[PDB]
Write an enzyme that holds these catalytic residues in place. Structure first.
Site, PDB file in Angstrom:
ATOM      1  N   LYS A  95       7.631   1.039   0.419  1.00 30.98           N
ATOM      2  CA  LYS A  95       8.355   0.394  -0.774  1.00 30.98           C
ATOM      3  C   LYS A  95       9.669   0.818  -1.317  1.00 30.98           C
ATOM      4  O   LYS A  95      10.435   0.162  -1.540  1.00 30.98           O
ATOM      5  CB  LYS A  95       7.249   0.388  -1.886  1.00 30.98           C
ATOM      6  CG  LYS A  95       6.005  -0.523  -1.492  1.00 30.98           C
ATOM      7  CD  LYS A  95       4.976  -0.577  -2.630  1.00 30.98           C
ATOM      8  CE  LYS A  95       4.664   0.826  -3.190  1.00 30.98           C
ATOM      9  NZ  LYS A  95       3.765   1.546  -2.069  1.00 30.98           N
ATOM     10  N   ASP A 151      -2.324  -0.324  -4.135  1.00 30.30           N
ATOM     11  CA  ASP A 151      -3.489   0.141  -3.720  1.00 30.30           C
ATOM     12  C   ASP A 151      -4.636  -0.223  -4.731  1.00 30.30           C
ATOM     13  O   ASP A 151      -5.576  -0.624  -4.297  1.00 30.30           O
ATOM     14  CB  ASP A 151      -3.743   1.664  -3.506  1.00 30.30           C
ATOM     15  CG  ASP A 151      -2.351   2.162  -2.743  1.00 30.30           C
ATOM     16  OD1 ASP A 151      -1.426   2.567  -3.268  1.00 30.30           O
ATOM     17  OD2 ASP A 151      -2.511   2.296  -1.586  1.00 30.30           O
ATOM     18  N   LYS A 181       0.885  -1.164   0.006  1.00 27.52           N
ATOM     19  CA  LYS A 181       0.018  -0.042  -0.006  1.00 27.52           C
ATOM     20  C   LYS A 181       0.930   1.170  -0.096  1.00 27.52           C
ATOM     21  O   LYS A 181       2.037   1.302   0.328  1.00 27.52           O
ATOM     22  CB  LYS A 181      -0.823   0.170   1.151  1.00 27.52           C
ATOM     23  CG  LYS A 181      -0.339   0.144   2.462  1.00 27.52           C
ATOM     24  CD  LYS A 181      -1.246   0.628   3.432  1.00 27.52           C
ATOM     25  CE  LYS A 181      -1.981   1.677   3.337  1.00 27.52           C
ATOM     26  NZ  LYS A 181      -1.053   3.003   4.056  1.00 27.52           N
ATOM     27  N   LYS A 240       4.156   8.380  -8.081  1.00 24.34           N
ATOM     28  CA  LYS A 240       4.935   9.593  -7.295  1.00 24.34           C
ATOM     29  C   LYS A 240       6.174   9.675  -7.884  1.00 24.34           C
ATOM     30  O   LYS A 240       6.951  10.817  -7.530  1.00 24.34           O
ATOM     31  CB  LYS A 240       5.045   9.067  -5.966  1.00 24.34           C
ATOM     32  CG  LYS A 240       5.400   9.854  -4.957  1.00 24.34           C
ATOM     33  CD  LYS A 240       5.089   9.466  -3.499  1.00 24.34           C
ATOM     34  CE  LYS A 240       5.630  10.387  -2.163  1.00 24.34           C
ATOM     35  NZ  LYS A 240       6.892  10.053  -1.839  1.00 24.34           N
TER      36      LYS A 240
HETATM   37  N1  ADP Z   1      12.025   1.236   8.583  1.00 24.97           N
HETATM   38  C1  ADP Z   1      11.612   2.705   8.476  1.00 24.97           C
HETATM   39  N2  ADP Z   1      12.054   3.362   9.495  1.00 24.97           N
HETATM   40  C2  ADP Z   1      11.818   4.702   9.570  1.00 24.97           C
HETATM   41  N3  ADP Z   1      11.104   5.490   8.659  1.00 24.97           N
HETATM   42  C3  ADP Z   1      10.898   4.654   7.431  1.00 24.97           C
HETATM   43  C4  ADP Z   1      11.179   3.386   7.439  1.00 24.97           C
HETATM   44  N4  ADP Z   1      10.629   2.972   6.060  1.00 24.97           N
HETATM   45  C5  ADP Z   1       9.659   3.943   5.658  1.00 24.97           C
HETATM   46  N5  ADP Z   1      10.261   5.191   6.368  1.00 24.97           N
HETATM   47  C6  ADP Z   1       9.517   6.464   5.889  1.00 24.97           C
HETATM   48  O1  ADP Z   1       8.205   6.304   5.330  1.00 24.97           O
HETATM   49  C7  ADP Z   1       8.025   7.039   4.427  1.00 24.97           C
HETATM   50  C8  ADP Z   1       7.480   6.410   3.491  1.00 24.97           C
HETATM   51  O2  ADP Z   1       8.271   5.431   2.855  1.00 24.97           O
HETATM   52  P1  ADP Z   1       8.299   5.127   1.375  1.00 24.97           P
HETATM   53  O3  ADP Z   1       9.461   3.978   1.030  1.00 24.97           O
HETATM   54  O4  ADP Z   1       8.234   6.211   0.305  1.00 24.97           O
HETATM   55  O5  ADP Z   1       6.755   4.598   0.948  1.00 24.97           O
HETATM   56  P2  ADP Z   1       6.101   3.967  -0.310  1.00 24.97           P
HETATM   57  O6  ADP Z   1       7.269   3.996  -1.730  1.00 24.97           O
HETATM   58  O7  ADP Z   1       5.534   2.775  -0.134  1.00 24.97           O
HETATM   59  O8  ADP Z   1       4.923   5.059  -0.687  1.00 24.97           O
HETATM   60  C9  ADP Z   1       9.163   7.768   4.090  1.00 24.97           C
HETATM   61  O9  ADP Z   1       9.256   9.103   4.542  1.00 24.97           O
HETATM   62  C10 ADP Z   1      10.233   6.709   4.616  1.00 24.97           C
HETATM   63  O10 ADP Z   1      11.303   7.757   5.001  1.00 24.97           O
HETATM   64 MG    MG Z   2       7.361   5.008  -3.254  1.00 23.39          MG
END
Ligand code: ADP
Ligand code: MG
Ligand code: ADP
Ligand code: SF4
Ligand code: SF4
Ligand code: MG
EC number: 1.18.6.1
Lengths: 272, 272
Positions: free
Chosen positions: A15, A129, A10, A41
């Site tokens: 990811k 999603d 999600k 994104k």
């Molecule tokens: N293990 C973790 N510890 C702290 N922050 C995290 C961790 N994994 C992700 N984040 C934070 O969560 C937010 C979303 O992560 P992201 O990889 O961009 O999500 P997605 O790609 O699934 O939308 C980012 O700001 C990232 O820095």
């Molecule tokens: Mg992403």
């Protein structure tokens, strides 16, 4: 040979952070890797490239005229550890299908010879999603044989994992797309590892790694880096190295067994 | 007249919980309301109906033969406070467009006279991780004049709010779809209210209410109820009553001003 892996889950679950750190650890190990961003994104490669984001194939094709006027060397960019990076892009909100750019990008990469022999891994970072249009294409068209789902004890994240698994089952008669495992990206909650282990067992897969919540991630990302590059001694760096080792060594690839909503609610009730 | 409102936001942010509690408070006030679920999860009415979920128009049409073999009284169900409830449904993952059921549902409701005169409000609960297909139809086809976006200090939630706003701008030349406000569904973090106020000001709208994180929500939902029904004396019940009052009284409906990713990152940096 190269292993074609896709990371689903999600929105906001982790990811892109998990994929880029996993890939940096693979590069640190000596593997040759390409990341293909399949999320509108379009920030799935910024930590490898030290960048704001990356200009997308859809954007570059439009400025150049057609996708045929693009050369692979114009579109693929190398960053930390020599990791090669590309972003699909997608139409603006409210216009056309949000996943249409994924189809254009993967076809461009195949035709232009991006899947050259000494690559060891390709990772697709895919919005999960909805499982339709270009976001389903990696599964429907047999592009990613190994699906790893990032999730957490959040109900919505577990629902998304179950929905992605239903898509894998739907295309099991063709190609070879399989579920490789769940990756728990922690919310810092008690028994969360046990909860995701139990979910993985019900689906027929495994929890490949539990990634802790650690503020070093934010400090690295403010500086446009992976934790692997930002602070190679961090405890969190060793966590991503452990995830990378287990992905390399993983041999369990299954057609999953999706669960009912009652089973999912019972999981959450039990683990409190 | 009736006010047609749509609740958008990223998955898991609190759309269905906020919508059902808001609507229960409106019903407690004496308003006549219909909820139309436009999310494939299809649990947008369960707290009004005291149910597991609700069978969807797509499912019922398939069992009956065609959507024309369905009667409105077969599809609409009344729950707490007389609130009327319907679920669109959608195709299974990996098959067809995830939003296709929304188009079928809204057209069915219009033709069958569901928009009868003494309704005061209709609320659509819409998936917002992508703005395309049936999920864009409430905006593209002028079905919901007032969009409220549930969000939080989470980067992904604010990104989603900006993406939905871009979709509103795209269709501003036709119809009358406008952004009515942001609803902050708290993650229990410091200065979060100020952060969402600042985002709303940049978009040209307002933060209509800050909804606290409160465990009474989970205790109510385990029992398939809104907090309004489960514990009318709860502090959280008064929060939803305040949100409902402000939605009723709101007169600011704007064409929003989407922001750049640099502006969004600057917001997060500043508010720490
Ligand atoms: N293990 C973790 N510890 C702290 N922050 C995290 C961790 N994994 C992700 N984040 C934070 O969560 C937010 C979303 O992560 P992201 O990889 O961009 O999500 P997605 O790609 O699934 O939308 C980012 O700001 C990232 O820095
Ligand atoms: Mg992403
Ligand atoms: N203000 C709140 N306090 C506590 N829990 C909440 C609150 N709002 C939502 N939740 C919980 O968050 C989860 C997701 O909310 P939901 O409304 O289903 O999200 P969406 O419809 O946006 O996917 C639910 O378990 C819900 O109980
Ligand atoms: S969901 Fe996006 S276009 Fe079908
Ligand atoms: S994104 Fe779903 S079908 Fe276009
Ligand atoms: Mg919902």
């Amino acid at each position: 040979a190269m292993r074609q892996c896709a990371i689903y889950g999600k929105g906001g679950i982790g990811k892109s952070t998990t994929t880029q750190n996993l890939v940096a650890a693979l590069a640190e190990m000596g593997k040759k890797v390409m990341i293909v961003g399949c999320d509108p994104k379009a920030d799935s490669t910024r930590l490898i490239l030290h960048s704001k984001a990356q200009n997308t194939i859809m954007e570059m094709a439009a400025e150049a005229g057609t996708v045929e006027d693009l050369e692979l060397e114009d579109v693929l960019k190398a960053g930390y550890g020599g990791v090669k990076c590309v972003e699909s892009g997608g139409p603006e909100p409210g216009v056309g299908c949000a996943g249409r750019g994924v189809i254009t990008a993967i076809n461009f990469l195949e035709e232009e010879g991006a899947y050259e022999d000494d690559l060891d891994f390709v990772f697709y970072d895919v919005l999960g999603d909805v499982v339709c249009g270009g976001f389903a294409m990696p599964i429907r068209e047999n592009k990613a044989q190994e699906i790893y789902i990032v999730c957490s004890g959040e109900m919505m994240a577990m629902y998304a994992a179950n929905n992605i698994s239903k898509g894998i089952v739907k295309y099991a008669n063709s190609g070879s797309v399989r579920l490789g495992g769940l990756i728990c990206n922690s919310r810092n909650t008690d028994r969360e590892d046990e909860l995701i282990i139990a979910l993985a067992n019900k689906l027929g897969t495994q929890m490949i790694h539990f990634v802790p919540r650690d503020n070093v991630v934010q400090r690295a990302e403010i500086r446009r880096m992976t934790v692997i590059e930002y602070d190679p001694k961090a405890k969190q760096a060793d966590e991503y190295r452990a995830l990378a080792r287990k992905v390399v060594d993983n041999k369990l690839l299954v057609i999953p067994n999706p669960i009912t909503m009652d089973e999912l609610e019972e999981l959450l009730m039990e683990f409190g």
